[PDB]
Amino acid sequence: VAIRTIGNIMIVTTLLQFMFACIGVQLFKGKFYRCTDEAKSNPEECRGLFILYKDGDVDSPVVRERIWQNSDFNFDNVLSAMMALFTVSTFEGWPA
Amino acid sequence: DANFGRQISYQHAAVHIPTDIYEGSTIVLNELNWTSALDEVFKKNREEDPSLLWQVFGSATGLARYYPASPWVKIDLYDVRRRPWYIQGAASP
Ligand SMILES: *[C@@H]1O[C@H](CO)[C@@H](O[C@@H]2O[C@H](CO)[C@@H](O[C@@H]3O[C@H](CO)[C@@H](O)[C@H](O)[C@H]3NC(C)=O)[C@H](O)[C@H]2NC(C)=O)[C@H](O)[C@H]1NC(C)=O
Numbered sequence: 307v308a309i310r311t312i313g314n315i316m317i318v319t320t321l322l323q324f325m326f327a328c329i330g331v332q333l334f335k336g337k338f339y340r341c342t343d344e345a346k347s348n349p350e351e352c353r354g355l356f357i358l359y360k361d362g363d364v365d366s367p368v369v370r371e372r373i374w375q376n377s378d379f380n381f382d383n384v385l386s387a388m389m390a391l392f393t394v395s396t397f398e399g400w401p402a
Numbered sequence: 403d404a405n406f407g408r409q410i411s412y413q414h415a416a417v418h419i420p421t422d423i424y425e426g427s428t429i430v431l432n433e434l435n436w437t438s439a440l441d442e443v444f445k446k447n448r449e450e451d452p453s454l455l456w457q458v459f460g461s462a463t464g465l466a467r468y469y470p471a472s473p474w475v476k477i478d479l480y481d482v483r484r485r486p487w488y489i490q491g492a493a494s495p
Contacts, residue, residue, distance in 0.1 A: 354424025357477070369421055369477050 323395075327387035338377035342370065349374040405453070408472050412448065415441045416471035420481050423464040433463045444469035460488045 341352035352374040360366040376382075379390040379399070394400040403410050417434070419425045440459055448454050448469070458468035466482035474480075482488055 351424070351427070353427070355421050357422055357479070367477060367479065 323388060323391055324384070327381075327384050327391055330381045330387045330391065331384055334381040336380075336382060338380040339374060340377075341374055342372040346372065405455075406470075406472075410470040410472045412445065412470045414471050415444055415467050415469040416474075418466045418468070418474055418480065418482070420464055421478055422481075425465075429463050430465060433461055433465060437461070437465075437467050440467060441469065458482075460485070 339349075341347070343352075343356040343358065345356075346352040352372050354372065355369055356372045357367045358370045360368055379386070379393060381387040381390060417437075419430065423430065425431075437459060444457060447457060456468050458466055460466045460482035462483070464481065464483065483492075
């Protein structure tokens, strides 16, 4: 019975989140990609192996693969935008 | 072979590509064609003077092609463009 009373609010807040997700898709569609090393800024040169310096020390290099990765929470489509926006409403990882 | 503390091959030339440089890109692959004609001159030089040591071409793209072929010597940090012999020929004091 309590759900039925609060059933009207859950329609407005779902419509509001859907519109924000559609706006968010227009803004950050595909723009959350990045390379494993912060020196390549497009998929063409984000290939092969690169030298990673552990904890910023120049005296401890290590070889790593560079992969053109995507954010776990992104705005590629409306389904991903709504899931990304739901985590924001919980105030978890929203600064990231 | 003698006067060569390693194992070498006179049939072709070896190409070194630094770790931070991805082989198979357009710049590197285009460099591997016009540098493939260097092998004939490499062999011709050695025929006239058998007592010839490493003869190497250091590219501005990064790769170094040397003759005779021999496997490269932790991780590798060699860059031909930072070598003292490359730097003196790239500019003046
Ligand atoms: C960069 O790569 C190019 C593509 O592989 C090389 O160009 C090809 O070299 C082949 C071998 O010489 C050529 O094959 C023969 O070439 C002779 C010479 O003109 C001709 O009789 C024919 O084109 C061909 N003979 C056949 C097919 O029976 C290719 O023609 C030639 N071009 C292509 C494939 O487009 C370059 O050699 C290489 N760079 C360097 C510096 O070698």
